[PDB]
Amino acid sequence: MYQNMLVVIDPNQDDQPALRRAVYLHQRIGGKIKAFLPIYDFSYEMTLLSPDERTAMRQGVISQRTAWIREQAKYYLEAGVPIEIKVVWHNRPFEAIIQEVIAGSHDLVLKMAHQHDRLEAVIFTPTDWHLLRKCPSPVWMVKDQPWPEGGKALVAVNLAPYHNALNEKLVKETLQLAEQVNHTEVHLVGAYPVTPINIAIEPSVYNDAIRGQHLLAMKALRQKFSIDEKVTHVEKGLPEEVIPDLAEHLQAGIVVLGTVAFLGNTAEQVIDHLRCDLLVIKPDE
Amino acid sequence: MYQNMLVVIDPNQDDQPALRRAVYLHQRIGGKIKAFLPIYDFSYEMTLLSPDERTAMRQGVISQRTAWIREQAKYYLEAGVPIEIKVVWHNRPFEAIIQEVIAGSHDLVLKMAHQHDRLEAVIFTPTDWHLLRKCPSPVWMVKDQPWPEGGKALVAVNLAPYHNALNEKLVKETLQLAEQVNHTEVHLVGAYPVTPINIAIEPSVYNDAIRGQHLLAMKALRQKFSIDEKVTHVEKGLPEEVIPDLAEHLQAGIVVLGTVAFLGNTAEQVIDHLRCDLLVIKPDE
Ligand SMILES: OC[C@H]1O[C@H](O)[C@H](O)[C@@H](O)[C@@H]1O
Ligand SMILES: OC[C@H]1O[C@H](O)[C@H](O)[C@@H](O)[C@@H]1O
Numbered sequence: 003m004y005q006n007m008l009v010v011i012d013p014n015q016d017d018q019p020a021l022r023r024a025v026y027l028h029q030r031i032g033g034k035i036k037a038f039l040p041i042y043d044f045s046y047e048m049t050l051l052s053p054d055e056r057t058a059m060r061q062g063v064i065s066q067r068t069a070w071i072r073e074q075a076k077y078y079l080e081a082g083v084p085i086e087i088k089v090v091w092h093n094r095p096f097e098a099i100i101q102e103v104i105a106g107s108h109d110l111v112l113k114m115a116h117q118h119d120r121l122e123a124v125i126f127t128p129t130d131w132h133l134l135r136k137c138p139s140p141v142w143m144v145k146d147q148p149w150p151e152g153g154k155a156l157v158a159v160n161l162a163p164y165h166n167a168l169n170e171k172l173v174k175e176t177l178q179l180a181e182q183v184n185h186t187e188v189h190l191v192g193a194y195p196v197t198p199i200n201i202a203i204e205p206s207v208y209n210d211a212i213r214g215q216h217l218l219a220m221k222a223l224r225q226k227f228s229i230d231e232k233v234t235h236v237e238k239g240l241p242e243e244v245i246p247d248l249a250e251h252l253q254a255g256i257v258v259l260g261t262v263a264f265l266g267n268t269a270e271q272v273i274d275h276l277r278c279d280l281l282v283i284k285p286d287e
Numbered sequence: 288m289y290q291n292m293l294v295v296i297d298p299n300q301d302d303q304p305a306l307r308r309a310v311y312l313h314q315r316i317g318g319k320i321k322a323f324l325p326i327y328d329f330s331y332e333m334t335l336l337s338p339d340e341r342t343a344m345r346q347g348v349i350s351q352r353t354a355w356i357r358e359q360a361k362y363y364l365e366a367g368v369p370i371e372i373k374v375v376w377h378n379r380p381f382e383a384i385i386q387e388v389i390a391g392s393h394d395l396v397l398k399m400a401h402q403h404d405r406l407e408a409v410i411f412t413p414t415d416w417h418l419l420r421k422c423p424s425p426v427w428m429v430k431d432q433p434w435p436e437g438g439k440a441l442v443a444v445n446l447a448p449y450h451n452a453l454n455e456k457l458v459k460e461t462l463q464l465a466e467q468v469n470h471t472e473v474h475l476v477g478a479y480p481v482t483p484i485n486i487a488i489e490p491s492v493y494n495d496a497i498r499g500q501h502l503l504a505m506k507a508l509r510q511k512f513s514i515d516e517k518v519t520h521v522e523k524g525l526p527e528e529v530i531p532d533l534a535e536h537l538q539a540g541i542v543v544l545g546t547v548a549f550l551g552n553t554a555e556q557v558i559d560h561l562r563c564d565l566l567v568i569k570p571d572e
């Protein structure tokens with residue numbers, strides 16, 4: 003399922019929700035965990051310091067963070083969770099992270115994103131954005147607030163040629179995971195656009211007809227996988243509207259998106275409006 | 288100076304601060320203005336509509352927006368400001384925009400960014416980010432709040448090999464513009480990092496010494512251009528700290544940044560914290 007998870011350690015605080023998520027997963031689906039932290043002190047480049055001194059600072063930071071990470075993780079290690087700690091020196095974390103993924107062939111990246119308030123959107127940093135856009139493996143952004151009780155997984159699917167295969171991957175992988183992880187109920191959503199009242203003046207047959215195709219496309223899919231109709235949703239509106247309203251209404255613990263350095267308009271507009279975890283999945287091909 | 292400006296029309300509202308900025312500029316530095324608006328209605332792809340109907344909708348939206356833009360801009364046209372209106376059909380605005388730039392060899396892109404409240408950061412959309420990262424020409428993000436009275440231009444410069452040339456371009460271009468535009472006073476800032484109290488335990492000689500180099504580097508530069516020392520700043524801290532504190536303290540109307548799809552850490556971290564216009568300049572080479 004995901005046997006090789008990379009958790010990106012957040013240097014700015016002791017608690018590591020991304021690691022906590024990784025352990026939660028491990029104990030249910032197996033798989034190894036690399037707890038990975040790239041750091042730097044720019045003062046590492048400022049003929050102002052000795053060569054020896056540059057080294058002692060660089061080596062001293064590696065050792066200290068490693069022990070700190072091990073302190074955070076002690077219970078998980080003593081519990082016998084297979085966690086490898088890698089702190090590395092690198093000035094560009096997202097590049098560091100993506101090179102680690104490729105080197106260690108990681109099949110999942112987990113990284114914390116902060117939500118300051120329950121009313122608001124999860125804050126995605128620039129690093130987060132570079133990951134989401136560019137990281138080859140799937141990327142799971144782990145909101146630092148509690149998982150809603152009985153929270154659902156919501157998968158956005160595209161309903162309007164080979165987009166068929168991408169949709170299939172997305173639903174396949176989400177289902178195999180939700181089923182080995184506490185049987186989280188999985189829902190599907192497709193939003194269809196209704197023509198702005200503005201564009202109109204250039205026919206509400208449009209409405210029923212488009213609603214028609216999408217329902218057909220949803221069913222075909224639902225059924226390639228024996229999904230219940232009741233967990234499948236076909237909605238009028240902008241994706242960035244529909245998906246987070248439906249997330250709130252469903253108490254979705256996570257939203258799962260598949261991609262088109264650019265995720266496609268749906269994903270770009272949506273991601274900035276999420277109030278729960280995000281999982282981004284790119285076509286492996 | 289900038290003889291070929293592209294203003295990205297914001298479809299979501301009537302008032303166009305980016306165009307208003309473009310006119311403001313024109314009447315002081317000359318140059319032509321293309322008022323550019325890419326649009327689409329996804330319903331344009333949904334065998335659900337006639338070929339004729341797809342066209343009538345597509346052609347009808349082009350014509351209507353064109354007249355709307357002309358309505359917004361009437362006073363500027365009647366005033367005799369040289370404004371070409373281009374509305375085009377394209378599903379990816381940032382791609383549309385960047386292709387227009389290359390096609391029309393635009394030397395400046397202006398586009399509005401919204402600040403919801405004076406206390407907060409200007410909201411950069413995903414499109415804004417793609418532009419800032421990828422658009423070949425300079426990109427001027429025009430905050431939709433008033434320009435501070437006597438507002439200054441603040442230029443971030445790098446102070447720690449060929450970074451010399453990039454710095455030079457940045458200061459040259461900002462100065463030639465501020466001087467033909469109302470003589471906006473230009474300031475320079477370089478921030479130097481102080482080693483976290485945390486990294487320490489692995490010498491406040493560091494402090495004075497690093498402060499030293501940067502002052503030397505600042506002066507060399509200031510003086511390649513006969514800049515007053517009093518408008519030049521060398522500060523301890525994170526760039527994302529120093530630059531917006533100094534912006535607030537200075538009443539800087541705009542912050543000018545030069546780049547390293549990635550602007551370099553300084554620019555990435557800073558941009559998300561700005562409370563004023565932004566101008567991004569990439570090495571032409
Ligand atoms: O949204 C404001 C954010 O800005 C700062 O980085 C704060 O330290 C963080 O707690 C907060 O959520
Ligand atoms: O979508 C592009 C994103 O790039 C940046 O990293 C910003 O953190 C965010 O405001 C923006 O939305």
Ligand SMILES: OC[C@H]1O[C@H](O)[C@H](O)[C@@H](O)[C@@H]1O
Nearest residue numbers: 401402403404407408409410
């Ligand atoms: O920050 C919240 C923003 O969200 C919405 O897009 C609002 O319409 C805009 O007025 C506001 O500034």
Ligand SMILES: [Zn+2]
Nearest residue numbers: 116117118119
């Ligand atoms: Zn917070």
Ligand SMILES: [Zn+2]
Nearest residue numbers: 401402403404
């Ligand atoms: Zn607002």
